[PDB]
DNA sequence: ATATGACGCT
DNA sequence: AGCGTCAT
């Protein structure tokens, strides 16, 4: 009772850009704004695979991973923008640079952890306290949170509109706030949400990009909260909202549970929602899923998670990959050498950029391949030393460490055909 | 036939 | 080290 830890010791946020690749193209081309539009790679095969969808196009049913020709059937007025192609492969330089614009603005407010190209976690714990002493006891007006939803609110007896429902929840939340108390976790989330409103106001104002965000006590709840009110809104998930939120929250919606372990949690325990995990003791969950998973599950279903926000705005690896599906699979020794050079050339261009910008050198190269028929994403991984940022040496050394896999007695041929080539620069050191 | 990045297990 | 899982 008096000695229970509720996991209310941190204020963690997850900011995620709304249809990021689309917004990047819409800022560059005004004709694409406020219209159903999507981003595609490789216009040849069925018009190109869609990798980002605007919300105007999502209303028609256009989704990611869909072929552009199929998406034109659902949305005939759909506009398209192609990803730049360099050396025969997709080139995402325009979006990595747009990412750095946002990451540097978020870095001004608090420590962030780059989670993807369009999202980063934030640890607002140190920023919330210093803001609390600056507001010497004065309350928080709703004008400081013009786009914040309070998950679970409004409730009970006192509108039909979406935005009307938002403020009544914020009103109930603010009216019950304990500003008398600086050790109140619910007050810390509110100050954290005020800061995120300022961060997101700075992002849109200095880049033109809109984003959603989640504010809670850990990374998992923040990411879940971020998806509740997209687009362009932030959601506060408090500790008290967890039981009702998790009572019907599918297990797959929780981070790290959308894969196989989440499936076995559903099958073995025979449950549907995240809240049903509270019935089980920790030893039971440890016996079914291991000591790490059982401990993590037992605390997560109660809204408690301890994975810290690592101060890391830079990637740990720099890699280049390209798939060769179907009959396009590389089957000649000349093809494999040529594409390894194309990958190594772009890799050098990115590594030299990384060494001048970020003062570090990659020290080893990882070569990954997939053969025709193998189900796993990777079929084989071999590694060597990355001494020079030389595209011809890297591609040559990459070929040296994979030429054994060629089960073809012929010199000029390559069997089995290669489905994917992948070079990855890892193991950085200060330069 | 939809290019990447972080991390755990052994 | 090499493979597997999870994610955008
Ligand atoms: N499977 C994939 N293939 C290629 N590119 C992808 C991808 N997933 C993401 N991207 C690229 C394209 C995306 O623009 C960006 C982030 O994708 P999200 O954050 O998962 N979803 P979005 O930001 O598009 O909209 P919203 O967050 O409101 O749902 O990374
Ligand atoms: Mg996004
Ligand atoms: Mg995202």
Give the CATH number, domain containing residue A258: 1.10.150.20
Verify that A230 and A277 share a domain, yes or no: no
Terminus-to-terminus CA distance in chain A, angstroms?
Answer: 52
Structure's resolution in angstroms:
2.6
Mutate to test the pocket of ligand 1, among A65, A118, A121 (most ligand atoms within 8 A of CB): A118
- Tell me whether strands A360-371 and A380-385 are parallel, antiparallel or unpaired: antiparallel
Residue (of A60, A61, A37, A41) closest to A50 by Cα position: A41
Is the Cβ atom of A362 under 6 angstroms away from ligand 1? no
Verify that A236 and A104 share a domain, yes or no: yes
Decide which of A69, A88, A107 is a domain's last residue: A88
**A143 among annotated binding-site residues:** no
Verify that A410 and A425 share a domain, yes or no: yes
One-character DSSP codes across A127-192? HHHHHHHHTTS----GGG-TTEEETT-S-S----SHHHHHHHHHHHHHHT--TT-TT-HHHHHHHH
**A205 among annotated binding-site residues:** no
Mark the nucleotides of strand B covered by protein, meaning any atom under 7 Å from a CB: 1-9
Which atom of ligand 1 lies closest to the CA of A41?
Answer: 4
Contacts of A384 (CB under 8 A, 6+ apart): A364, A365, A367, A397, A398, A400, A401
Which atom of ligand 1 lies closest to the CA of A18?
Answer: 28
Query: What distance in angstroms lies between residue A103's CA and the mean position of ligand 2's atoms?
Result: 14
One-character DSSP codes across A70-121? HHHHH-TT-EEEEPPEETTEE--HHHHHHHHHHHHHHHTTSEEEE-SSSEEE
Verify that A107 and A145 share a domain, yes or no: yes
Alpha carbon A341 to chain centroid, angstroms: 30
- The residue whose two tokens read 């939340």 is A173
CATH of the domain at A370: 3.30.1490.100
Verify that A246 and A218 share a domain, yes or no: yes
User: What ligand has the least distance to the C-alpha of A23?
Assistant: 1
What angle is formed at CA A358 by the lines to CA A353 and CA A363, rounded to 5 degrees? 80
Structural domain including A264 reads: 251-308
Q: What are the beta bridge partners of residue A80?
A: A38
Nucleotide closest to residue A64 (CA–C1'): B2
CATH of the domain at A183: 3.30.70.270
Verify that A264 and A361 share a domain, yes or no: no
Mutate to test the pocket of ligand 1, among A24, A49, A52 (most ligand atoms within 8 A of CB): A52
Verify that A53 and A184 share a domain, yes or no: no
Q: How far is the C-alpha of A94 from the C-alpha of A73, rounded, in Å?
A: 29
The Cα-based distances of A361 to A133, A313, A346, A358 in angstroms read 42, 16, 16, 9
| Beta-carbon count within 10 A of A290 CB | 13
Verify that A154 and A12 share a domain, yes or no: yes
Is the Cβ atom of A62 under 6 angstroms away from ligand 1? no
User: What ligand has the least distance to the C-alpha of A223?
Assistant: 3
Contacts of A151 (CB under 8 A, 6+ apart): A225, A228, A235, A236, A237, A238, A241, A245
CATH of the domain at A70: 3.40.1170.60
Question: Is A162 in contact with A213 (CB distance < 8 Å)?
Answer: no
Residue (of A14, A52, A19, A56) closest to A234 by Cα position: A14
Nucleotide closest to residue A16 (CA–C1'): C8
Within A305-395, strands assigned E span 318-323, 330-332, 360-371, 380-385
Is A212 buried (19+), middle (13-18) or exposed (0-12) by CB count in 10 A?
A: buried
Method: X-ray
Q: Is the dihedral of CA A202, A205, A207, A209 positive or negative?
A: positive
Verify that A260 and A386 share a domain, yes or no: no
- The residue whose two tokens read 């609110």 is A153
Question: Is A179 in contact with A185 (CB distance < 8 Å)?
Answer: no
Q: How far is the C-alpha of A15 from the C-alpha of A122, rounded, in Å?
A: 8
Decide which of A308, A342, A374 is a domain's last residue: A308
Q: What are the beta bridge partners of residue A425?
A: A318, A365
Residue (of A278, A207, A219) closest to A246 by Cα position: A278
Residue (of A349, A354, A361, A421) closest to A387 by Cα position: A361
Verify that A72 and A93 share a domain, yes or no: no
User: What ligand has the least distance to the C-alpha of A19?
Assistant: 1
Residues in reach of strand B, judged by a CB distance below 7 angstroms, are A 41-42, 45, 49-51, 64-65, 89-90, 92, 114, 290, 292, 310, 312, 315-323, 325-328, 377, 420, 422, 424
Is A332 buried (19+), middle (13-18) or exposed (0-12) by CB count in 10 A?
A: middle
Is the Cβ atom of A209 under 6 angstroms away from ligand 1? no
Nucleotide closest to residue A258 (CA–C1'): C6
Atom 2, ligand 1: residue with shortest CA distance = A51
Q: How far is the C-alpha of A196 from the C-alpha of A213, rounded, in Å?
A: 8
Decide which of A88, A108, A129 is a domain's last residue: A88
Question: Is A128 in contact with A192 (CB distance < 8 Å)?
Answer: yes
Q: Is the dihedral of CA A405, A409, A410, A411 positive or negative?
A: positive
Verify that A47 and A186 share a domain, yes or no: no
Verify that A243 and A296 share a domain, yes or no: no
Domain count, chain A: 4
């Amino acid at each position: 009772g008096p000695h229970m830890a509720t996991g209310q010791d941190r204020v963690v946020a997850l900011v995620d850009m709304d249809c990021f690749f689309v917004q990047v193209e819409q800022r560059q081309n005004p004709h694409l704004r406020n219209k159903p539009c999507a981003v595609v790679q490789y216009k040849s095969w069925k018009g190109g695979g869609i990798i980002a969808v605007s919300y105007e196009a999502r209303a028609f049913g256009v989704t990611r991973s869909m072929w552009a020709d199929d998406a034109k059937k659902l949305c005939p007025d759909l506009l398209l923008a192609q990803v730049r192609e360099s050396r025969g492969k997709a080139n995402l330089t325009k979006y990595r640079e747009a990412s750095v614009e946002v990451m540097e603005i978020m870095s001004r407010f608090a420590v962030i952890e780059r989670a993807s190209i369009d999202e980063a976690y934030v640890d607002l714990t140190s920023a919330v306290q210093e803001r609390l002493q600056k507001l010497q006891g004065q309350p928080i007006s709703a004008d400081l949170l013009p786009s914040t939803y309070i998950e679970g609110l409004p409730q009970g007896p006192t509108t039909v509109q979406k935005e009307g429902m938002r403020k009544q929840g914020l009103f109930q939340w603010l009216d019950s706030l304990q500003i008398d108390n600086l050790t109140s976790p619910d007050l810390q989330l509110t100050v954290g949400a005020v800061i995120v409103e300022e961060m997101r106001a700075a992002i849109e104002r200095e880049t033109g990009f809109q984003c959603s965000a989640g504010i809670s006590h850990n990374k998992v709840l923040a990411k879940l909260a971020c998806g509740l009110n997209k687009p362009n809104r932030q959601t506060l998930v408090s500790h008290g909202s967890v039981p009702q939120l998790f009572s019907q929250m599918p297990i797959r919606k929780i981070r790290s549970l959308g894969g196989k372990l989440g499936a076995s949690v559903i099958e073995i325990l025979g449950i549907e929602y995240m809240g049903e995990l509270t019935q089980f003791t920790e030893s039971q969950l440890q016996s079914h899923f291991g000591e790490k998973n059982g401990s993590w599950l037992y605390a997560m279903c109660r809204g408690i998670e301890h994975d810290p926000v690592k101060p890391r705005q830079l990637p740990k690896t720099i890699g280049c990959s390209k798939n060769f599906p179907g009959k396009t699979a590389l089957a000649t020794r000349e093809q494999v050498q040529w594409w390894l050079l194309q990958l190594a050339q772009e890799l050098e261009e990115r590594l030299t950029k990384d060494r001048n910008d970020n003062d570090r050198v990659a020290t080893q190269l990882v070569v990954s391949i997939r053969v025709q028929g193998d189900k796993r994403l990777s079929s084989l991984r071999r590694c060597c030393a990355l001494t020079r940022y030389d595209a011809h040496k890297m591609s040559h050394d990459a070929f040296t460490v994979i030429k054994n896999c060629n089960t073809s007695g012929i010199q000029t041929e390559w069997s089995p055909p290669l489905t994917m080539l992948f070079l990855c620069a890892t193991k950085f050191s200060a330069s």
